[PDB]
Amino acid sequence: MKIVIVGIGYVGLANAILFSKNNENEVVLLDIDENKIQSINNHKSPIKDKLIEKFFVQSKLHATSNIKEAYFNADFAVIATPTDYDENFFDTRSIENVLKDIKNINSKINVIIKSTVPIGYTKTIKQKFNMSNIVFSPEFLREGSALYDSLYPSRIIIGDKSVLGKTIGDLFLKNIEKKNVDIFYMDSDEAESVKLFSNTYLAMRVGFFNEVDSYARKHNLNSADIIKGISADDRIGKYYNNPSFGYGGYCLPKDTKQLLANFYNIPNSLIKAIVETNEIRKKFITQLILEKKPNILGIYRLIMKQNSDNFRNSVIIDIIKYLQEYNSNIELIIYEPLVKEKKFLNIKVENDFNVFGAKVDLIIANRFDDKLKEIKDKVFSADVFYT
Amino acid sequence: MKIVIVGIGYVGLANAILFSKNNENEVVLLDIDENKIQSINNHKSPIKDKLIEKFFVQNKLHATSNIKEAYFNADFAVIATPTDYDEQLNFFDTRSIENVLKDIKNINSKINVIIKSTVPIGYTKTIKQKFNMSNIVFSPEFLREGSALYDSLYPSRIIIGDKSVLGKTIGDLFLKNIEKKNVDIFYMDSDEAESVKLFSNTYLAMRVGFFNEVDSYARKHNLNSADIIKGISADDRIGKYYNNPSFGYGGYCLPKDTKQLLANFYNIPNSLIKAIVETNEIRKKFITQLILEKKPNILGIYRLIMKQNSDNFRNSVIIDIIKYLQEYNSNIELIIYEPLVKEKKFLNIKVENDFNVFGAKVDLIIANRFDDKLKEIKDKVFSADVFYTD
Numbered sequence: 001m002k003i004v005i006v007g008i009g010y011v012g013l014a015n016a017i018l019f020s021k022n023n024e025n026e027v028v029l030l031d032i033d034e035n036k037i038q039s040i041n042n043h044k045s046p047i048k049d050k051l052i053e054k055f056f057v058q059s060k061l062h063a064t065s066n067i068k069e070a071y072f073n074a075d076f077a078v079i080a081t082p083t084d085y086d087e088n089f090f091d092t093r094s095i096e097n098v099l100k101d102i103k104n105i106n107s108k109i110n111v112i113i114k115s116t117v118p119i120g121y122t123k124t125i126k127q128k129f130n131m132s133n134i135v136f137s138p139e140f141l142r143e144g145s146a147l148y149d150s151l152y153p154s155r156i157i158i159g160d161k162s163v164l165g166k167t168i169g170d171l172f173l174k175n176i177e178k179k180n181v182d183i184f185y186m187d188s189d190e191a192e193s194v195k196l197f198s199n200t201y202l203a204m205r206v207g208f209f210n211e212v213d214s215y216a217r218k219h220n221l222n223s224a225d226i227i228k229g230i231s232a233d234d235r236i237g238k239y240y241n242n243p244s245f246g247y248g249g250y251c252l253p254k255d256t257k258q259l260l261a262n263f264y265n266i267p268n269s270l271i272k273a274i275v276e277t278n279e280i281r282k283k284f285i286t287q288l289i290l291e292k293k294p295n296i297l298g299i300y301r302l303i304m305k306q307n308s309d310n311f312r313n314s315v316i317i318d319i320i321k322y323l324q325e326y327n328s329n330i331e332l333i334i335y336e337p338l339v340k341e342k343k344f345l346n347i348k349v350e351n352d353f354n355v356f357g358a359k360v361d362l363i364i365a366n367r368f369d370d371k372l373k374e375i376k377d378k379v380f381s382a383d384v385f386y387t
Numbered sequence: 388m389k390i391v392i393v394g395i396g397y398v399g400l401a402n403a404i405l406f407s408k409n410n411e412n413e414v415v416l417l418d419i420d421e422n423k424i425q426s427i428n429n430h431k432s433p434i435k436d437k438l439i440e441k442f443f444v445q446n447k448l449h450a451t452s453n454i455k456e457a458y459f460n461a462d463f464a465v466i467a468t469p470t471d472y473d474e475q476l477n478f479f480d481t482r483s484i485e486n487v488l489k490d491i492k493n494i495n496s497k498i499n500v501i502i503k504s505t506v507p508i509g510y511t512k513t514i515k516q517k518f519n520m521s522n523i524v525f526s527p528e529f530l531r532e533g534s535a536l537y538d539s540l541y542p543s544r545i546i547i548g549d550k551s552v553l554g555k556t557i558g559d560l561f562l563k564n565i566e567k568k569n570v571d572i573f574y575m576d577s578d579e580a581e582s583v584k585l586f587s588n589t590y591l592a593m594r595v596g597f598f599n600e601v602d603s604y605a606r607k608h609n610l611n612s613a614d615i616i617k618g619i620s621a622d623d624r625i626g627k628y629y630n631n632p633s634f635g636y637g638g639y640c641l642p643k644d645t646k647q648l649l650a651n652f653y654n655i656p657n658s659l660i661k662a663i664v665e666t667n668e669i670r671k672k673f674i675t676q677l678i679l680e681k682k683p684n685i686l687g688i689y690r691l692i693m694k695q696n697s698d699n700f701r702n703s704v705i706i707d708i709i710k711y712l713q714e715y716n717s718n719i720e721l722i723i724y725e726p727l728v729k730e731k732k733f734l735n736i737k738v739e740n741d742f743n744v745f746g747a748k749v750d751l752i753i754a755n756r757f758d759d760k761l762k763e764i765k766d767k768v769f770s771a772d773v774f775y776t777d
């Protein structure tokens with residue numbers, strides 16, 4: 001049985017691995033990025049940070065840009081290509097590019113959309129392509145625990161109640177490790193809702209605990225004490241409650257603005273504030289840095305959490321832009337090993353840590369790590385639990 | 388060893404029983420309402436609570452309105468008087484606490500005072516200074532009405548807003564009398580403790596606010612709310628609890644505590660805090676618009692309480708819906724089924740406590756929560772209840 005994964009990002013690569021670790025399945029990764037295809041076929045993970053990166057070193061797997069080769073004789077196709085939101089613009093052109101290829105080569109491949117889409121998208125795209133063999137099943141994995149989250153999903157959501165739905169459902173149950181998983185079958189608009197609203201809840205919770213931290217900072221109260229006290233209510237819980245410079249990453253900022261596009265022309269809403277509180281928190285962090293009046297500022301890591309490959313839409317890049325807007329006279333210096341060029345966004349990169357720590361008045365880091373501990377004293381961070 | 392509990396309410400009564408079960412404590416409830424004092428003295432729980440009734444069943448406490456009698460030789464006083472947010476003047480009302488501290492200061496200024504009533508952030512620090520008493524400790528209450536004593540015996544955690552040995556005495560006093568084994572207890576300064584309470588309630592209001600906005604969206608687009616909410620809640624970071632949509636969040640405390648924190652969020656262009664309050668009012672007006680779209684001629688209100696277990700409807704969201712209905716379309720004839728109401732009318736609305744006549748009289752029934760009785764009439768019943776948690 002042949003499975004095509006379209007897109008070698010975090011979602012596609014984790015799903016490719018999930019389906020390939022059992023000898024019965026032939027898995028093919030399809031992309032337009034020949035760098036990604038060339039990496040895979042050299043048994044290197046293009047996504048530099050993979051928890052279970054033991055998979056590549058110790059189940060076979062094949063990548064190609066060849067539409068013909070991939071979809072030829074394929075039973076399922078998983079669409080894991082980018083979807084963005086740009087303004088109100090719902091960018092799904094990668095999905096329509098794949099579906100157009102799929103409808104050309106062969107149309108009866110059972111298509112699973114994993115990329116996050118607008119509510120009502122899947123029902124619309126089936127009508128407009130004249131294809132009923134398309135099922136939306138959202139993806140809930142975290143970057144940098146992608147394959148773990150794929151083997152042990154929180155739950156499986158199948159946006160189809162027909163027999164095509166149960167078909168897609170059994171395909172995932174028979175390949176995940178997690179057992180007695182919650183699996184919910186529902187119509188497609190409901191599944192798309194589950195995804196946008198789930199991410200919007202998580203954004204809201206981060207926004208909540210950062211408003212707590214902001215409040216504590218303005219009145220010079222102990223944040224850890226307050227958050228620990230709040231979180232001991234089991235209805236609130238001791239997790240996912242560590243203040244930061246703000247929520248970011250690839251999806252939460254996009255998906256919250258998505259849902260807010262649906263929530264226009266009502267006077268206010270949690271959905272609007274979930275977006276707006278994040279920008280206020282980032283500007284407040286910036287104001288706090290300015291008040292320390294540094295002359296040379298070191299940005300420690302462009303990533304947000306320390307188990308992260310990338311800084312795509314990292315909050316700390318937003319902090320850089322706010323610093324540049326409110327006081328371009330503050331010289332900024334980045335310590336970020338992942339960047340090989342020595343200017344990122346016109347800011348000097350200094351990947352000698354000793355030179356970086358000595359050069360700067362003040363270091364801002366979203367999260368502490370042991371490498372920062374030596375110079376703890378010049379470090380500004382909202383990190384409370386050191387997660 | 389002698390503990391005075393001030394306020395015979397949900398918090399006071401629960402704490403008073405919490406301490407009197409232990410027969411080495413002498414426990415006195417002190418109140419201004421002679422009706423509630425009478426009831427207590429007649430071994431009569433003036434409220435309803437499963438474990439509270441069982442305690443009164445099993446076997447103790449005494450009540451009075453004489454402050455000299457209560458406070459004489461008291462080691463501890465627990466203040467459980469009402470704190471209100473009053474919309475006029477945008478302020479939280481703490482007079483009751485100050486009236487009680489004045490009595491304490493004049494009769495026995497050295498009683499160890501424990502404030503359980505919810506107060507503004509910074510209150511206890513300022514009130515210790517204003518009365519010149521450092522023997523005052525804030526310790527928030529987290530009980531839910533109708534599980535008040537279970538939550539007292541088995542509290543999620545203890546928060547003591549004083550890091551000195553007096554606070555250690557207060558925390559240790561609660562450890563002794565609770566039955567929850569190996570409970571989380573946090574010592575912290577008083578502002579942080581006041582912050583914990585207001586923010587914890589604000590989070591809960593936020594969560595109800597969130598799942599109602601989900602329900603609102605789903606209704607606007609004819610989607611299945613139960614599907615959507617179950618799929619959301621299956622994420623263990625979100626959780627399968629405290630997520631049942633409704634006409635809006637209500638009760639004594641959530642509506643006042645969120646508005647108080649919002650006041651203490653001075654001049655912020657937007658915030659979760661402000662939205663948490665505003666979304667509740669939008670949800671309520673949306674519920675009302677939905678009811679009116681059904682163009683009922685005679686509308687039945689099933690219960691004024693928020694939930695079956697409750698036996699009170701102070702700040703019940705049902706009543707806000709009633710008031711919006713009266714404002715948006717005064718032509719609909721409203722009828723209330725509420726056995727807790729003994730008078731012929733409430734808010735000038737006919738009360739019909741014969742369930743037979745009520746169900747036949749009306750074209751459509753609104754109920755915040757389904758119960759046993761309504762399944763028989765389910766087809767003219769409008770509710771946002773998704774899980775029938777009753």
Ligand SMILES: NC(=O)c1ccc[n+]([C@@H]2O[C@H](COP(=O)([O-])OP(=O)(O)OC[C@H]3O[C@@H](n4cnc5c(N)ncnc54)[C@H](O)[C@@H]3O)[C@@H](O)[C@H]2O)c1
Binds near residue numbers: 010012033080097143
């Ligand atoms: N990043 C996450 O943690 C996460 C989690 C859940 C859902 N999602 C959703 O999945 C989508 C993909 O996430 P990602 O971060 O793994 O993507 P990504 O940006 O890391 O990579 C997507 C891949 O798709 C390739 N591609 C682009 N257009 C293509 C086309 N027409 N045909 C074939 N391949 C094409 C790209 O070359 C790229 O390699 C997100 O946009 C979002 O909708 C992401």
Ligand SMILES: NC(=O)c1ccc[n+]([C@@H]2O[C@H](COP(=O)([O-])OP(=O)(O)OC[C@H]3O[C@@H](n4cnc5c(N)ncnc54)[C@H](O)[C@@H]3O)[C@@H](O)[C@H]2O)c1
Binds near residue numbers: 397420423469531
């Ligand atoms: N009700 C809850 O679920 C809950 C939970 C946690 C905290 N709290 C906090 O506890 C406070 C009280 O809650 P409640 O439900 O018990 O309120 P309640 O109104 O039912 O209890 C008030 C009692 O205190 C009496 N009282 C008023 N003034 C007094 C005075 N000067 N001296 C002595 N007694 C006086 C009143 O006569 C009344 O009997 C709330 O305002 C809230 O701040 C409530």
Ligand SMILES: O=c1ccn([C@@H]2O[C@H](COP(=O)(O)OP(=O)(O)O[C@H]3O[C@H](CO)[C@@H](O)[C@H](O)[C@H]3O)[C@@H](O)[C@H]2O)c(=O)[nH]1
Binds near residue numbers: 304
């Ligand atoms: O305690 C916390 C936890 C998270 N964050 C920030 O919130 C953002 C989201 O973090 P996280 O949810 O841990 O990782 P993501 O890779 O962004 O995954 C989220 O976004 C994915 C994209 O859809 C979803 O599939 C995941 O379930 C969802 O967790 C990040 O900026 C975090 O740094 C905090 O500030 N404090």
Ligand SMILES: O=c1ccn([C@@H]2O[C@H](COP(=O)(O)OP(=O)(O)O[C@H]3O[C@H](CO)[C@@H](O)[C@H](O)[C@H]3O)[C@@H](O)[C@H]2O)c(=O)[nH]1
Binds near residue numbers: 528635638704
């Ligand atoms: O899934 C849910 C849960 C609650 N609510 C509503 O939210 C309000 C408050 O509900 P609940 O918290 O269950 O009862 P309370 O007795 O008001 O207790 C709250 O208010 C007290 C603050 O004083 C705290 O001590 C408690 O921890 C806190 O739960 C009520 O209107 C509920 O009907 C919903 O609509 N859906």
